[PDB]
């Protein structure tokens, strides 16, 4: 219903150690930096870019530890105080309850891929219907050409 609470990415409640990723371009672009509204490091999480439209092998993983309801997600690019250009034009959500068995989130219609950002600055809020029940959430940047992506995220929902 109305459980759109920030789960801890910008606030710091989800600590650094709980945020992992496939790869990182630099230490300053590490997974931990992919927190919504953060300007620390080089401004976001950036993998050893670019993301290949055919091989979507890159991801940002958040470990929530307990089982949550994820009703909404929020994404941003690498604003880096107006000097950054990068963002994910699209992404897909993968999720696990045990960290072993991964489920691709799919809309009521059946589409996997969600529309991402249009710039590195503005937060884009994408609702999740059906809502996700997970302990682990993965954000996979999705593209149409080999482009450099960067992300800052936030998960919204409540605990079980």
């Amino acid at each position: 219903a109305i459980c759109r609470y920030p789960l801890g990415m910008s606030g710091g409640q989800i600590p650094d150690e709980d945020i992992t990723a496939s790869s990182q371009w630099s230490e300053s672009t590490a997974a931990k930096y992919g927190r919504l509204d953060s300007e620390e490091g080089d401004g976001a999480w950036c993998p050893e870019i670019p993301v290949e439209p055919d091989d979507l092998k890159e991801f940002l993983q958040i470990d929530l530890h307990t089982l949550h309801f994820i009703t909404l997600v929020g994404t941003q690019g690498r604003h880096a105080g107006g000097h950054g250009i990068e963002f994910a034009p699209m992404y897909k959500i993968n999720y696990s309850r045990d960290g072993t068995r991964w489920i691709s989130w799919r809309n009521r219609h059946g589409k996997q891929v969600l529309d991402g950002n249009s710039n590195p600055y503005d937060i884009f809020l994408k609702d999740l219907e059906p809502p996700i029940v997970a302990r682990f959430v993965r954000f996979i940047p999705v593209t149409d050409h080999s482009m450099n992506v960067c992300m800052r995220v936030e998960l919204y929902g409540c605990v079980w």
Partner: nanobody, 112 residues
């Protein structure tokens, strides 16, 4: 290095258009006296335009390719908008660690 111009004194509620010329990634920044440089707006290169929450709706950015100059129409100007305005080229992470050399920036005073 880019050069900004077109500033001056304006009454609250007023309007002003700033100019900039010497480069796809391009941004508008301002320095209020006693404050650090902050982002105001940027035009990417499907040309995507974005504005700081503090200037959303009130300000507009547009790139001229017949004059190789980017403009910033600042409508409904309030006191808070008093600063020295600048423009600089945006960079990819691959160029993030390269020094920034700013250039000329015009004074904009929004007083009654």
């Amino acid at each position: 290095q880019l050069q900004a111009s077109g500033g001056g004194f304006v009454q609250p509620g007023g309007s002003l258009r700033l100019s900039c010329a010497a480069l796809d990634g391009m941004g508008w920044f301002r320095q209020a006296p006693g404050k650090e440089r902050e982002f105001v707006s940027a035009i990417s290169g499907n040309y995507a335009s974005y504005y700081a929450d503090s200037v959303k709706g009130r300000f507009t950015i547009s790139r001229d390719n017949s004059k190789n100059t980017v403009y910033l129409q600042m409508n409904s100007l309030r006191a808070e908008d008093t600063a020295t305005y600048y423009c600089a080229p945006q960079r990819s992470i691959y160029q993030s660690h390269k020094p920034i050399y700013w250039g000329q920036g015009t004074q904009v005073t929004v007083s009654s």
